[PDB]
PDB file of N, CA and C and ligand atoms in Angstrom:
ATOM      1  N   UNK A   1    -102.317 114.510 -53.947  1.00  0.00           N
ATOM      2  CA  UNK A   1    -103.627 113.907 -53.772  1.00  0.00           C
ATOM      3  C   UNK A   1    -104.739 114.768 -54.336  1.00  0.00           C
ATOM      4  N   UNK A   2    -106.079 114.216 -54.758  1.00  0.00           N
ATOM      5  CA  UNK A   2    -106.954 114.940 -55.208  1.00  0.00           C
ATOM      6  C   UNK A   2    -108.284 114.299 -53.930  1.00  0.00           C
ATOM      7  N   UNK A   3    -108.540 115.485 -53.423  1.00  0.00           N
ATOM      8  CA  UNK A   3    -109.964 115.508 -52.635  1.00  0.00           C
ATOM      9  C   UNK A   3    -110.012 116.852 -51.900  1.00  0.00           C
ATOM     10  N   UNK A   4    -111.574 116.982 -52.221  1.00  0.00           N
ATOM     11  CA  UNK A   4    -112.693 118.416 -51.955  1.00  0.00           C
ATOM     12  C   UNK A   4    -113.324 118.610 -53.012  1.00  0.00           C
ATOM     13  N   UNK A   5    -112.885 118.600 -53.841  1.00  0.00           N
ATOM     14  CA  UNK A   5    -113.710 118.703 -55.243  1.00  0.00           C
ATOM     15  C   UNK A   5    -114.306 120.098 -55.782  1.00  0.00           C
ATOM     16  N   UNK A   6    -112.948 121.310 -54.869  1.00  0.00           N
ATOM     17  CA  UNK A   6    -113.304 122.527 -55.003  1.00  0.00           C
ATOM     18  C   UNK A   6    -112.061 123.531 -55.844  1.00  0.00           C
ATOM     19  N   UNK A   7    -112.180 124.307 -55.942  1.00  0.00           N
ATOM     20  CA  UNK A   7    -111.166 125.376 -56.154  1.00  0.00           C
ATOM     21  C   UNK A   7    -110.062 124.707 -55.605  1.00  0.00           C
ATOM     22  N   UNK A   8    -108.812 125.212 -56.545  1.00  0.00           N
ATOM     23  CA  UNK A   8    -107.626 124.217 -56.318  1.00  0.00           C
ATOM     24  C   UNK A   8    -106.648 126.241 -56.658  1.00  0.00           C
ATOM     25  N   UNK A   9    -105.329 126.350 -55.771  1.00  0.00           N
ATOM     26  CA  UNK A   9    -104.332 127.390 -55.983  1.00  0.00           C
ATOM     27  C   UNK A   9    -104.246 127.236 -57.789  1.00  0.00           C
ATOM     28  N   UNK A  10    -103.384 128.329 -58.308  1.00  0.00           N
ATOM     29  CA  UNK A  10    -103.186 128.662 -59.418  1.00  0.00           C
ATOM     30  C   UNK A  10    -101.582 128.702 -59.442  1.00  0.00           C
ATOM     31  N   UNK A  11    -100.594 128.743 -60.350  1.00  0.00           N
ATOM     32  CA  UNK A  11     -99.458 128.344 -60.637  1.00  0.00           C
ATOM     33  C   UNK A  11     -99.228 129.956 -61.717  1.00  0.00           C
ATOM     34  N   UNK A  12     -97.874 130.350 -62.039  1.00  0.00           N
ATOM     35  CA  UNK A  12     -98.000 131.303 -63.008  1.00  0.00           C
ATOM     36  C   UNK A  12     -97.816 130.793 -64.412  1.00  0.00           C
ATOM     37  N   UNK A  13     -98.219 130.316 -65.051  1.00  0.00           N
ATOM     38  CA  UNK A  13     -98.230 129.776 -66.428  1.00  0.00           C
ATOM     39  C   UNK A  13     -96.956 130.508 -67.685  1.00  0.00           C
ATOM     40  N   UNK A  14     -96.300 130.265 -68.528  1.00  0.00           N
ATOM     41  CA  UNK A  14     -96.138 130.811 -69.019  1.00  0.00           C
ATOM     42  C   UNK A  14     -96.219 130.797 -70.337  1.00  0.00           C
ATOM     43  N   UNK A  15     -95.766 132.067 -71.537  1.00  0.00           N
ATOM     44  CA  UNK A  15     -95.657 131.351 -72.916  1.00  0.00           C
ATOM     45  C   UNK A  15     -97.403 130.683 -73.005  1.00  0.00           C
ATOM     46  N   UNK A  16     -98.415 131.370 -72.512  1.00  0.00           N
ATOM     47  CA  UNK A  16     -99.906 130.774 -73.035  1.00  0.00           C
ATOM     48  C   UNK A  16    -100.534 132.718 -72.926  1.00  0.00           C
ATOM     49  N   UNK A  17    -101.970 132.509 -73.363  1.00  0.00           N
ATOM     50  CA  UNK A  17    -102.939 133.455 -73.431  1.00  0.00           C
ATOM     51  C   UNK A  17    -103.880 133.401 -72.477  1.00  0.00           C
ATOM     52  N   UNK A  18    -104.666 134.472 -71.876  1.00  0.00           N
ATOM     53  CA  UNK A  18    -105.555 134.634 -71.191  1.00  0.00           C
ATOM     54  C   UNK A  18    -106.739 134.147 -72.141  1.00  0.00           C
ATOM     55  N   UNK A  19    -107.714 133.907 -71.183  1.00  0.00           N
ATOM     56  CA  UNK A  19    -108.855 133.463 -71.797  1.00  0.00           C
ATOM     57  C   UNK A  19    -109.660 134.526 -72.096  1.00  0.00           C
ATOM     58  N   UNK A  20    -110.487 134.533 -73.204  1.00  0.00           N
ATOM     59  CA  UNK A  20    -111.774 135.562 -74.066  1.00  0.00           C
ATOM     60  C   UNK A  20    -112.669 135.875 -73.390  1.00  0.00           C
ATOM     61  N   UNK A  21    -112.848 134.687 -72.123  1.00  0.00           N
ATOM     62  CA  UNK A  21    -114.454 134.801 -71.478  1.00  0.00           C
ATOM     63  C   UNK A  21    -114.151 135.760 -70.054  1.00  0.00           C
ATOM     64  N   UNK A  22    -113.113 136.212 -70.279  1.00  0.00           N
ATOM     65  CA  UNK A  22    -112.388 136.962 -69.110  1.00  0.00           C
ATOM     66  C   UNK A  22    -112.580 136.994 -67.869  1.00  0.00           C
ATOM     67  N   UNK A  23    -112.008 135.622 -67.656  1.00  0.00           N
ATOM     68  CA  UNK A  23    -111.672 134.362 -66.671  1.00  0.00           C
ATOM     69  C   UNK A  23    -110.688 134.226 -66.218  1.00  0.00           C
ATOM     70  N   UNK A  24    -109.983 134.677 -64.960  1.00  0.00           N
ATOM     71  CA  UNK A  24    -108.660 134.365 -64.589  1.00  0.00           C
ATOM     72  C   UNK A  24    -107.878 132.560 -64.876  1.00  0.00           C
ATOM     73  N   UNK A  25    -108.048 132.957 -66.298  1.00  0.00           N
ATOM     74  CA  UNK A  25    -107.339 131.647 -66.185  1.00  0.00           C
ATOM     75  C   UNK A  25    -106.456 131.376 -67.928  1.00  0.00           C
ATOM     76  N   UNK A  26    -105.751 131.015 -68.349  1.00  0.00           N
ATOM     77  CA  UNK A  26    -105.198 131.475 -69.535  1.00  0.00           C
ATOM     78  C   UNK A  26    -104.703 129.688 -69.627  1.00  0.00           C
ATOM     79  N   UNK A  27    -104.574 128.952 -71.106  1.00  0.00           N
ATOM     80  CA  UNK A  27    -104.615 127.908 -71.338  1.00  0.00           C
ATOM     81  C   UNK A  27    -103.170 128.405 -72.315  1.00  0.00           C
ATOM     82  N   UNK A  28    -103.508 128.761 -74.117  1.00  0.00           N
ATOM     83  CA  UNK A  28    -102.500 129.013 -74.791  1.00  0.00           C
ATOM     84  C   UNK A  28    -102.980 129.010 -75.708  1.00  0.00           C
ATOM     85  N   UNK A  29    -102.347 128.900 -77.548  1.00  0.00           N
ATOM     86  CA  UNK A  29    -103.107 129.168 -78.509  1.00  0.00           C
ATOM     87  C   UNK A  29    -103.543 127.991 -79.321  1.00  0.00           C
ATOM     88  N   UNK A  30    -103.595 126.985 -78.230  1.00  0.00           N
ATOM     89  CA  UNK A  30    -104.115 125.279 -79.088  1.00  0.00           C
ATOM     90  C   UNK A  30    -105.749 125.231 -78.263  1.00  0.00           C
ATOM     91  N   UNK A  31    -105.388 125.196 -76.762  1.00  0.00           N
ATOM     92  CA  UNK A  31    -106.233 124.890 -75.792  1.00  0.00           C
ATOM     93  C   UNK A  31    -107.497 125.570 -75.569  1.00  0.00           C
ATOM     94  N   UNK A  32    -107.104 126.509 -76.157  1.00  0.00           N
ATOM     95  CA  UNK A  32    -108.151 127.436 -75.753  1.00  0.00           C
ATOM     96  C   UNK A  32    -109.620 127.099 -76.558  1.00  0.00           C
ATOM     97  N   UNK A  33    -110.058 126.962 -77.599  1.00  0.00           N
ATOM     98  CA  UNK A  33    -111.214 126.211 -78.320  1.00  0.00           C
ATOM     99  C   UNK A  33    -111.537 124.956 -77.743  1.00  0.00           C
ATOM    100  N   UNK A  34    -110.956 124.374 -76.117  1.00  0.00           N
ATOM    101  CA  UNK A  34    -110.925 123.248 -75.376  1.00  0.00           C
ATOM    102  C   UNK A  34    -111.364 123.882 -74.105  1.00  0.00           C
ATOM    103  N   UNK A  35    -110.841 125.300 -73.803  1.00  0.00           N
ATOM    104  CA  UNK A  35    -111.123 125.823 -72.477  1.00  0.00           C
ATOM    105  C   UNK A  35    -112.605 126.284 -72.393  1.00  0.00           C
ATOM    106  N   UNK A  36    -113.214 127.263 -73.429  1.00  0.00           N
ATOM    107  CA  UNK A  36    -114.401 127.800 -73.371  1.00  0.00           C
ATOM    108  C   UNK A  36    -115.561 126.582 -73.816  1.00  0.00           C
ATOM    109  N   UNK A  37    -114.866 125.829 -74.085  1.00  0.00           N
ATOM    110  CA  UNK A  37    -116.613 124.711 -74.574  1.00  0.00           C
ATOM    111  C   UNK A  37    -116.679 123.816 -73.142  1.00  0.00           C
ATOM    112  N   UNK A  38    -116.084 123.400 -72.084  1.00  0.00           N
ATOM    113  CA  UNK A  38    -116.362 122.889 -70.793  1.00  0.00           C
ATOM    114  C   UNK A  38    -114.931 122.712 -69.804  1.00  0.00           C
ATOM    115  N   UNK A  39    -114.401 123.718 -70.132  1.00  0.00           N
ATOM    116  CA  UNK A  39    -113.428 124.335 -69.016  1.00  0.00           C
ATOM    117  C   UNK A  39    -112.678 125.041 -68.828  1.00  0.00           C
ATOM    118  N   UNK A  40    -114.180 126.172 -69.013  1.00  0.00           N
ATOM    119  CA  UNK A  40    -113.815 127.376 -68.619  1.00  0.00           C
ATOM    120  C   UNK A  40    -114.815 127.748 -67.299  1.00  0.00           C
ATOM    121  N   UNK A  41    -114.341 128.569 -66.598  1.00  0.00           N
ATOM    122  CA  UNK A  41    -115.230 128.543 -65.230  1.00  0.00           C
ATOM    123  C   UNK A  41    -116.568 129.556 -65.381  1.00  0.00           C
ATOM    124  N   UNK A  42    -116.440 130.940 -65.783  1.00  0.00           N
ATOM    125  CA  UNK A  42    -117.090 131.775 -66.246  1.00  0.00           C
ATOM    126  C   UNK A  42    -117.583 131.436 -67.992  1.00  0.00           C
ATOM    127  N   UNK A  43    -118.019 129.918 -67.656  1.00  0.00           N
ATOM    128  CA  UNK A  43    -118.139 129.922 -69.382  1.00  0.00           C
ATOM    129  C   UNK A  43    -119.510 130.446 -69.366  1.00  0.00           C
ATOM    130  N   UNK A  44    -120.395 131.128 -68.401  1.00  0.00           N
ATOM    131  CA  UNK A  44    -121.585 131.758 -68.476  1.00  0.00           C
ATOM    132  C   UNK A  44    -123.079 130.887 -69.049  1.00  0.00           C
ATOM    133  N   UNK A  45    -122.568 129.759 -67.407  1.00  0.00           N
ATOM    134  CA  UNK A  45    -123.747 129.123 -68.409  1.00  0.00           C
ATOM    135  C   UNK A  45    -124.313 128.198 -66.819  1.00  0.00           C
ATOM    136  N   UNK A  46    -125.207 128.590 -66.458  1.00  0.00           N
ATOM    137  CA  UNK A  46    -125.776 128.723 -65.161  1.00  0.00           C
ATOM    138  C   UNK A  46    -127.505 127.450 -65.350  1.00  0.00           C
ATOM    139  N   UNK A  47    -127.817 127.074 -63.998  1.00  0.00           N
ATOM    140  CA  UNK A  47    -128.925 125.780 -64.466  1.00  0.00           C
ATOM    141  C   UNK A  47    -130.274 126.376 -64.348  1.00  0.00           C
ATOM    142  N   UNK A  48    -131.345 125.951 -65.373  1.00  0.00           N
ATOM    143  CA  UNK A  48    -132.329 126.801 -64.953  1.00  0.00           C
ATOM    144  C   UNK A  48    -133.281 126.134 -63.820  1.00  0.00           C
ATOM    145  N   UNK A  49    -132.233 125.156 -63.122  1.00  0.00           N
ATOM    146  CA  UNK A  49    -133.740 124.921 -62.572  1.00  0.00           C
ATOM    147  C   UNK A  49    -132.662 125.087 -60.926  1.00  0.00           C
ATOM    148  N   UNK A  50    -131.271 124.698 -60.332  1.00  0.00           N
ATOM    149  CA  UNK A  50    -131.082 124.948 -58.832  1.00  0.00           C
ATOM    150  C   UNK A  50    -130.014 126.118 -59.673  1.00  0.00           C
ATOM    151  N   UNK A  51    -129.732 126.677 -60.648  1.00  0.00           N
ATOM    152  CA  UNK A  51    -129.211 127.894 -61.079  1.00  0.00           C
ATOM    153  C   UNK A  51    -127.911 127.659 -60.555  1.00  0.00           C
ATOM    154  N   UNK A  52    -126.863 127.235 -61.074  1.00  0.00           N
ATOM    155  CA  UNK A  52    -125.914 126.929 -60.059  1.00  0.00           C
ATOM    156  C   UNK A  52    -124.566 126.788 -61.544  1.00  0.00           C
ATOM    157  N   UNK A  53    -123.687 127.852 -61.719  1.00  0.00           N
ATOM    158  CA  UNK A  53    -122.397 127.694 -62.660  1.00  0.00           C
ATOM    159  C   UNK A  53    -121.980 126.831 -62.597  1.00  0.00           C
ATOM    160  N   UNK A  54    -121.995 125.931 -64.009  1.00  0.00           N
ATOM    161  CA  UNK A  54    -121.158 124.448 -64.119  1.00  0.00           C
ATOM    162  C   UNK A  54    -120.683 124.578 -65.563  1.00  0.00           C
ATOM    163  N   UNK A  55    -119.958 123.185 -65.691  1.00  0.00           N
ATOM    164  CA  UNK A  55    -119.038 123.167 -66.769  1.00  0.00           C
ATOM    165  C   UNK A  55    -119.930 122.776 -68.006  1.00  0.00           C
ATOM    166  N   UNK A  56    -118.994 121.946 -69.142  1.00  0.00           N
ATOM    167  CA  UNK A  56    -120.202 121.750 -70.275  1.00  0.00           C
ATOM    168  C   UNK A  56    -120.446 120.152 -70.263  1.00  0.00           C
ATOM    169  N   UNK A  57    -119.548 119.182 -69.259  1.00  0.00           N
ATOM    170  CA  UNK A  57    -119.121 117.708 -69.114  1.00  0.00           C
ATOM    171  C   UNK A  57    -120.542 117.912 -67.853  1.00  0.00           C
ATOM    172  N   UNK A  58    -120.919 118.510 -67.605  1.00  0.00           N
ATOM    173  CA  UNK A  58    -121.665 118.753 -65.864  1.00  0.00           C
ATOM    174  C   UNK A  58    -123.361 119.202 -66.856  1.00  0.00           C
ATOM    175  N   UNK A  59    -123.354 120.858 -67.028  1.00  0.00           N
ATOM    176  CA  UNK A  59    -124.594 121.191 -67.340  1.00  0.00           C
ATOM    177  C   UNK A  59    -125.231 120.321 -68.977  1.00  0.00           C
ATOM    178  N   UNK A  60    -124.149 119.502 -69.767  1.00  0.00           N
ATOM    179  CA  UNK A  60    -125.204 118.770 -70.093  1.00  0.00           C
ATOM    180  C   UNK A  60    -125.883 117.703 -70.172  1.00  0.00           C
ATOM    181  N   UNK A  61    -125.228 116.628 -68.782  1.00  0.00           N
ATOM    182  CA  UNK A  61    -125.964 115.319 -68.107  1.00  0.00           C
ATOM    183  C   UNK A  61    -126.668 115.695 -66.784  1.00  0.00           C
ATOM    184  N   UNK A  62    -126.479 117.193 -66.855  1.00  0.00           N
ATOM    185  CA  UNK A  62    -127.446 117.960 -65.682  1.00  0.00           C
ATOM    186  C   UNK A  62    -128.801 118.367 -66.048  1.00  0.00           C
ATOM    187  N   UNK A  63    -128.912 118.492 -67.129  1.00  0.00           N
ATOM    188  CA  UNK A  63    -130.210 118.800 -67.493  1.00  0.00           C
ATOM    189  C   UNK A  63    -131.468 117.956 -66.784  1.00  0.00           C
ATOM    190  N   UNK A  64    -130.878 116.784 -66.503  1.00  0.00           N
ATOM    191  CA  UNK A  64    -131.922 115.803 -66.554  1.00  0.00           C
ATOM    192  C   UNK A  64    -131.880 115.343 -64.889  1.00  0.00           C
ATOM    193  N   UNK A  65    -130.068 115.392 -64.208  1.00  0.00           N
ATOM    194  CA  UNK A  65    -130.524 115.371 -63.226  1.00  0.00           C
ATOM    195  C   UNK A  65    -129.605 116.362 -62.234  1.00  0.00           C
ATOM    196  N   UNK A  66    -130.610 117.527 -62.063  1.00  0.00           N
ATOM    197  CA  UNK A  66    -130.523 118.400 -61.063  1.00  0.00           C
ATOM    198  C   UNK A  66    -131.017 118.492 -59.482  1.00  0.00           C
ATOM    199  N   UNK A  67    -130.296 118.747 -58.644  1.00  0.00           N
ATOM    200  CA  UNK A  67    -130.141 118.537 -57.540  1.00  0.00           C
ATOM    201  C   UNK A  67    -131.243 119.315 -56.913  1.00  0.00           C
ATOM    202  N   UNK A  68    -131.505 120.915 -57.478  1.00  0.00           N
ATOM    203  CA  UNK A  68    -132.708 121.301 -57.663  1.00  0.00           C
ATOM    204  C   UNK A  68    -133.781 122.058 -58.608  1.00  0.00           C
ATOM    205  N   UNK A  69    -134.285 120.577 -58.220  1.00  0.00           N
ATOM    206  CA  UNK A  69    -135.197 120.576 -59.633  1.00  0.00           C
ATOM    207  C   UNK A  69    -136.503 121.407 -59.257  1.00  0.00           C
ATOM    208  N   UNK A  70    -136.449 121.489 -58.385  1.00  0.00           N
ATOM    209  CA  UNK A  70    -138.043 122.397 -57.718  1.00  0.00           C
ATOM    210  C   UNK A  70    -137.640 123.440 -56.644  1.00  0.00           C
ATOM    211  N   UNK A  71    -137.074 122.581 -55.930  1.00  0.00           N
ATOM    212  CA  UNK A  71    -136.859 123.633 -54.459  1.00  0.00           C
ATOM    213  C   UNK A  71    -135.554 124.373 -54.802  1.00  0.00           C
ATOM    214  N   UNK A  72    -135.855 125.624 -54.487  1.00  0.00           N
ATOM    215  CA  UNK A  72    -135.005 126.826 -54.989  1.00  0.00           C
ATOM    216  C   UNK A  72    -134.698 127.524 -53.583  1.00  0.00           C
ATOM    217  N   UNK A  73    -134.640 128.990 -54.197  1.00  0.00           N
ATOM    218  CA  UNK A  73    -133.726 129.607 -52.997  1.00  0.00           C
ATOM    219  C   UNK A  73    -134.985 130.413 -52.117  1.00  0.00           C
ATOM    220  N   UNK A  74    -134.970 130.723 -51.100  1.00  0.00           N
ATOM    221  CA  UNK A  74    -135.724 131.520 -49.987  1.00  0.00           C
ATOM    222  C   UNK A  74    -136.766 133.101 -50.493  1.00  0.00           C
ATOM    223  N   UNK A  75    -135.623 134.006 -50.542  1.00  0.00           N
ATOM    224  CA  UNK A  75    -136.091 135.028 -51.143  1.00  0.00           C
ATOM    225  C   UNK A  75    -135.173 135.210 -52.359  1.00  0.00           C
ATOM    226  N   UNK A  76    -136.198 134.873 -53.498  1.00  0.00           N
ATOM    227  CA  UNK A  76    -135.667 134.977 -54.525  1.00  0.00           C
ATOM    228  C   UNK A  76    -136.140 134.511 -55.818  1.00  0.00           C
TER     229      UNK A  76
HETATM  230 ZN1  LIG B   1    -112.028 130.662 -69.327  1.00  0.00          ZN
HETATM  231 ZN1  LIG B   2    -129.316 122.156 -61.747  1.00  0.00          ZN
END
C-alpha cells in the first residue's frame, strides 16, 4: 500500500552508483541524469518563500502556489 506521503525504508540496491549530489541514495549509470533533475532528495533546491526542500515535479508548480507565501518561521 502507499499512504503518509513521507520517507519510505531503503532496500540494498545492487550493480547501480551512488548519487553526485551526495545523497544516500544511488540509481545506476542510465538513471542518474533522471535522479538529480527531480528525484533527487538533496537536489539543493529549497522555496524562497515557506523555504521548504522539494523535488523539481513540486518546486516548479510551487512557485506559484506555496503554502507559505508570507507567513514564515518565528525566530528567523
Ligand atoms: Zn540524489
Ligand atoms: Zn513554498
Amino acid at each position: 500500500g502507499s499512504s503518509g506521503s513521507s520517507g519510505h525504508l531503503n532496500t540494498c540496491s545492487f550493480n547501480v552508483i551512488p548519487c553526485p549530489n551526495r545523497c544516500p541514495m544511488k540509481l545506476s549509470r542510465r538513471d542518474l541524469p533522471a535522479h538529480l533533475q527531480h528525484d533527487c532528495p538533496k537536489r539543493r533546491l529549497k522555496c524562497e518563500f515557506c523555504g521548504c526542500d522539494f523535488s523539481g515535479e513540486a518546486y516548479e508548480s510551487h512557485e506559484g502556489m506555496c503554502p507559505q507565501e508570507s507567513s514564515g518561521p518565528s525566530s528567523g
